[PDB]
Amino acid sequence: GTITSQDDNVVVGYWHNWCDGRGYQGGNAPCVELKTVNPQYNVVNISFMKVYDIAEGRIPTFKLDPTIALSEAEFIAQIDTLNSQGRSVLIALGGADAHIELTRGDEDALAAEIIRLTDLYGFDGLDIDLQQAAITAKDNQFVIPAALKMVKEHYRKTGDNFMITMAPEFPYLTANGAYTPYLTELDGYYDFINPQFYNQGGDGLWIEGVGWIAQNNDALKEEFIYYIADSLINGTRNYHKIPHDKLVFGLPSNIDAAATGYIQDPQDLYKAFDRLKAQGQPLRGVMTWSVNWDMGTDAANNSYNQQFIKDYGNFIHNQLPPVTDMTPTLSGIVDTRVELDSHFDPLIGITAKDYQGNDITADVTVSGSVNTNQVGDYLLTYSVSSDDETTNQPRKITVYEILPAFTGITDTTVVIDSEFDPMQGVSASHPTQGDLTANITVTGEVDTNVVGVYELTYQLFYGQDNQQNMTDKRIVTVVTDAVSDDDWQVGSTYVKDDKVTHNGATWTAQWWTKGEEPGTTGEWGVWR
Ligand SMILES: [Cl-]
Ligand code: NA
Ligand code: NA
Ligand code: NA
Ligand code: NA
């Protein structure tokens, strides 16, 4: 069949390329033929395209498991049957332990293999379902988007909309999280994102004024669904913006299909979706891991018997078609600190795209101004308009200054009659003003002919017109080279006629003494 895309809401279901998967609660997921998958699953994702053996090279591929009892030809025929029904069949790239480690330059070959598989099997697009190390391994974050743009354009040439979807685990969707390059590079190229709102335990989000809402909290499931989706569709609460017309809510089919995240009470989903629609932002659908689990059995060998599609199929299909959020994006805007008197260019590193991913960087405008000749905060606002929408974002620019530093202002002792240069070994520096040694003055003098302590005060003048300054002090002590009688010590024993130095004087012992301090023994005591 032909490349078949979905114009309206989706119920996405993954399809296992394996048999008898073991459940989180001891159930079993049989392999199933594509032709048995409920019609209401209008997007079916073949799981998974991956590296099977490092020995085959770095480019991942898809190898049907023959034990599903479909030949290559029958598999192709079943996909053609789904397409004849207006249903889409994607290839899901990634999954657990996918072992994808692409290197820069691999994008041509990955694009070529995506095309080969798409043309052979009749796939309608590709789901990015990178997990764990694969999300960030080697150059995957560059290679995968680069390849997918090429694919998309290859099929656009023939009037075909090759679908691109992604299935990020939700915690990675924070504004500077690991999925950022995929979401940003492919803005305009992707049809929808179906994050996984499951298998993340106690992860969740903080709602100011309300509290913490966790993905595993079954008492607050309506709130979880509402708030995480509200945050995504508006780019609030530290999440990257995914437009509501492109947000599909990914869920476990049942308690065997995932560790956590199953919706106990479907009413929580209906009401959360209803609230989103009530604020003018209906979502695009739901997604499940998986059709095999929906058709599986529990530990007691009782059949799940399609409960997930029973609960959600009609709810999601019985909705109006999506209304495109055409707001544009700005990228690269980050608060920035700049050194006093450095050059600042408000446009560098900043870009913009329309809702279709076209570059509209030239249409960016900036209000506000930075004066790098004056420390302080400067607030800029960037704006861009396209498609009768406008996006605005602030940027704070802080101009700062670092203090210069002295070196060599160290207290020192020099010998009588030595030559002393107060500037020897003294310098100053500043990161931008450079060598400031010539801007140091010295207050005070040292007289090395005279024993004593000499204070020097160093001042540095700097900046524009040398109107800033800083100061430091140094003590230079001049000591004689004359030999003196030895210093008195409290525990020493001295003999009549022994001489010692103490408190600036020379004293001679008049008789035997230990522990008597010279100068303290009066007019007629032992030291004179
Ligand atoms: Cl499984
Ligand atoms: Na097709
Ligand atoms: Na509840
Ligand atoms: Na999954
Ligand atoms: Na000092």
Q: What is the length of the chain?
A: 528
Instruction: Indicate whether 332 and 464 sit together in one domain.
Output: no
Dihedral in degrees, nearest 10, Cα atoms 39, 41, 46, 47: -130
Contact at 8 Å (CB) between 459 and 440? Answer: yes
Q: What is the Cα–Cα distance from 334 to 72, expressed in whole angstroms?
A: 51
Enumerate the known binding-site residues for N-acetyl-D-glucosamine: 96, 289, 293
How many structural domains compose the chain?
4
Q: What is the Cα–Cα distance from 7 to 11, expressed in whole angstroms?
A: 12
Q: Tokens at residue 433, please?
A: 């003003």
Q: What is the Cα–Cα distance from 131 to 449, expressed in whole angstroms?
A: 79
Contact at 8 Å (CB) between 330 and 350? Answer: yes
DSSP designation for 438: G
Distance between Cα 119 and ligand 2 center (Å): 8
The three-point CA angle 102-103-106 to 5° equals 80
* 411-444 core/surface letters (b: 16 or more CB in 10 A; e: else): eeeeeeeeebebeeebebebeebeebeebbeeee
Instruction: Indicate whether 301 and 340 sit together in one domain.
Output: no
Distance between Cα 352 and ligand 1 center (Å): 41
Instruction: Indicate whether 336 and 446 sit together in one domain.
Output: no
Ligand (nearest to CA of 168) = 4
Distance between Cα 95 and ligand 4 center (Å): 7
C-alpha pair distances (Å), 236 with each of 165, 205, 282, 471: 22, 11, 17, 49
What is the residue range of 146's domain? 1-320
Ligand (nearest to CA of 289) = 4
Resolution of the determined structure in angstroms stands at 1.5
C-alpha pair distances (Å), 78 with each of 3, 142, 189: 14, 34, 27
Distance between Cα 44 and ligand 4 center (Å): 13
Instruction: Indicate whether 279 and 375 sit together in one domain.
Output: no
Ion ligand 3, residue ranges at CB < 5 A: 219
Enumerate the known binding-site residues for Ca(2+): 214, 217
Instruction: Indicate whether 427 and 505 sit together in one domain.
Output: no
Distance between Cα 413 and ligand 5 center (Å): 13
CATH code at position 527 = 2.10.10.20
Contact at 8 Å (CB) between 349 and 335? Answer: no
C-alpha pair distances (Å), 199 with each of 170, 257, 460: 10, 10, 62
Distance between Cα 456 and ligand 5 center (Å): 9
User: How determined?
Assistant: X-ray
Contact at 8 Å (CB) between 510 and 496? Answer: yes
Enumerate the known binding-site residues: 96, 214, 217, 289, 293
Contact at 8 Å (CB) between 314 and 40? Answer: yes
Ion ligand 2, residue ranges at CB < 5 A: 1, 4, 83, 122, 124
Distance between Cα 13 and ligand 1 center (Å): 13
Q: What is the Cα–Cα distance from 360 to 173, expressed in whole angstroms?
A: 25
Instruction: Indicate whether 496 and 394 sit together in one domain.
Output: no
Distance between Cα 132 and ligand 1 center (Å): 17
Instruction: Indicate whether 27 and 60 sit together in one domain.
Output: yes
Q: What is the Cα–Cα distance from 422 to 495, expressed in whole angstroms?
A: 45
Ligand (nearest to CA of 471) = 5
Contact at 8 Å (CB) between 363 and 386? Answer: yes
Q: Tokens at residue 135, please?
A: 């999300």
Q: Tokens at residue 303, please?
A: 């059949």
Last residue of a domain, one of 282, 298, 320: 320
Last residue of a domain, one of 373, 399, 425: 399
Q: Token pair 């600042």 is at which residue? A: 344
Ligand (nearest to CA of 290) = 4
Q: What is the Cα–Cα distance from 164 to 152, expressed in whole angstroms?
A: 8
Distance between Cα 89 and ligand 2 center (Å): 7
Instruction: Indicate whether 90 and 137 sit together in one domain.
Output: yes
Q: What are phi and psi of 312, to 5 degrees?
A: -120, -20
Instruction: Indicate whether 87 and 33 sit together in one domain.
Output: yes
**CA-CA-CA-CA torsion sign (158, 160, 166, 167):** negative
Ligand (nearest to CA of 1) = 2
CATH code at position 342 = 2.60.40.10
Contacts of 114 (CB under 8 A, 6+ apart): 91, 126, 147, 148, 151
DSSP designation for 174: B
238: left (phi over 0), alpha (psi -120 to 50) or beta: left
Maximum separation of any 2 CA atoms in the chain, in Å: 126
Ligand (nearest to CA of 18) = 1
Consecutive H or E run containing 141? helix 140-156
Instruction: Indicate whether 287 and 328 sit together in one domain.
Output: no
Instruction: Indicate whether 371 and 458 sit together in one domain.
Output: no
Contacts of 38 (CB under 8 A, 6+ apart): 291, 294, 306, 309, 313
Q: What is the Cα–Cα distance from 80 to 89, expressed in whole angstroms?
A: 9
Q: What is the Cα–Cα distance from 323 to 234, expressed in whole angstroms?
A: 15
